[PDB]
Design a protein around this ligand. Structure first.
Ligand SMILES: Nc1nc2c(ncn2[C@@H]2O[C@H](COP(=O)(O)OP(=O)(O)OP(=O)(O)O)[C@@H](O)[C@H]2O)c(=O)[nH]1
Ligand SMILES: Nc1ncnc2c1ncn2[C@@H]1O[C@H](C[C@@H](N)CC[C@H](N)C(=O)O)[C@@H](O)[C@H]1O
Ligand code: NA
Ligand code: NA
Ligand code: NA
Ligand code: NA
Ligand code: NA
Length: 288
């Protein structure tokens, strides 16, 4: 399946990204952890403690069910329902004093753009990140790539009321064309909504652009400086040599293309390799 190949590729991206920044003994806070599908990736990195928070009780229930079916684990796991973006994290974690804060790593996969609903939420998310992180610690994850979004939008005429593009397995549909009416610039970095469909994965969910320059400038205000901004394709090309043989046999065969090399080809290439970017920052100073 194109979708199976996409899932395997993005799973590989996460393995690589987690390993790149997470070191043995680290304490990890995972924001918007969903159903907690990356635990084994953090275990491979040798962490000491994992704290996962998600706003969905149904997702946390599933993550706890997945956790409790694991065995011989060498790290502690805390899984919590709470709002990571609209409220202070202290609300979510107060009844879990076993959390070891500040932590060494904050991660967030396929979710941070929901914090760009408004400026207030973007700032609250960043304040939660930096208050949780030690000086010198890292914040990393995976988001839709505003630069690829802008490329596509720059090819859409102003006559289109709901700018849209896609292929047989994915589709983006913007709520409005204010980008096009405003000289190919969003009227605000925040709240710029589009619905995202990905076959058998994402059911037309509204989400928000995360303009990378605004994310970066806000992060700097809160004391975090840029470490990584490579799109999935470039990231994979650069890192796969060190990993081709680190991956499970099943993940490796899944990554093999028809020409015998590694990556994605075919219809899944655009959504898997171009639509998303990695990000990482380092906390370099305390924020008042
Ligand atoms: N644009 C966008 N894509 C997302 C979002 N969440 C997930 N994705 C995409 O959907 C893929 C995940 O497909 P799933 O079927 O959810 O697989 P999974 O995350 O491995 O499985 P679970 O642990 O059960 O959640 C990701 O690799 C991304 O391509 C999102 O909020 N926005
Ligand atoms: N304000 C919020 N605080 C915490 N989690 C949120 C918030 N808004 C959305 N989410 C979660 O963000 C997640 C988005 C998912 N696309 C990604 C989940 C997970 N990281 C994964 O990669 O599978 C969901 O699990 C949502 O419930
Ligand atoms: Na972006
Ligand atoms: Na819009
Ligand atoms: Na936006
Ligand atoms: Na986005
Ligand atoms: Na920055």
């Amino acid at each position: 399946s194109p979708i199976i190949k996409l899932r395997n590729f993005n799973n590989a991206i996460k393995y690589i990204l987690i390993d790149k920044f997470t070191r043995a003994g680290d304490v990890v806070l995972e924001l918007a952890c969903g159903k907690g599908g990356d635990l084994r990736k953090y275990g491979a990195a040798g962490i000491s403690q994992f704290i996962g928070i998600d706003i969905s009780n149904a997702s946390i229930t599933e993550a706890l069910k997945r956790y409790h079916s694991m065995k011989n684990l060498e790290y502690q796991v805390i899984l919590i329902t709470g709002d990571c973006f609209g409220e202070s994290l202290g609300v979510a974690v107060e009844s879990f004093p076993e959390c070891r804060f500040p932590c060494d790593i904050v991660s967030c996969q396929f979710a941070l753009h929901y914090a760009f609903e408004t400026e207030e939420k973007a700032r609250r998310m960043l304040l939660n990140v930096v208050k949780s992180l030690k000086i010198g610690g890292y914040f990393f994850g995976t988001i839709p790539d505003s630069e690829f979004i802008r490329y596509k939008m720059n090819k859409i005429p102003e006559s289109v009321e709901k700018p849209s593009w896609g292929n047989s397995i994915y589709k983006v549909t913007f709520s409005n064309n204010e980008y096009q009416k405003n000289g190919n610039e969003f009227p605000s970095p925040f709240g710029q909504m589009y619905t995202f469909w990905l076959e058998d994965a994402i059911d037309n969910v509204p989400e928000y652009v995360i303009p990378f320059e605004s994310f970066r400038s806000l992060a700097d205000e809160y004391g975090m400086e840029l470490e990584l901004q490579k799109g999935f394709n470039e990231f994979f090309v650069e890192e796969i040599p060190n990993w081709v043989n680190r991956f499970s046999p099943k993940m490796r065969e899944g990554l093999k293309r028809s020409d015998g090399r590694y990556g994605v080809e075919g219809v899944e290439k655009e959504p898997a390799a171009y639509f998303y970017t990695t990000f990482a920052f380092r906390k370099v100073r305390d924020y008042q």
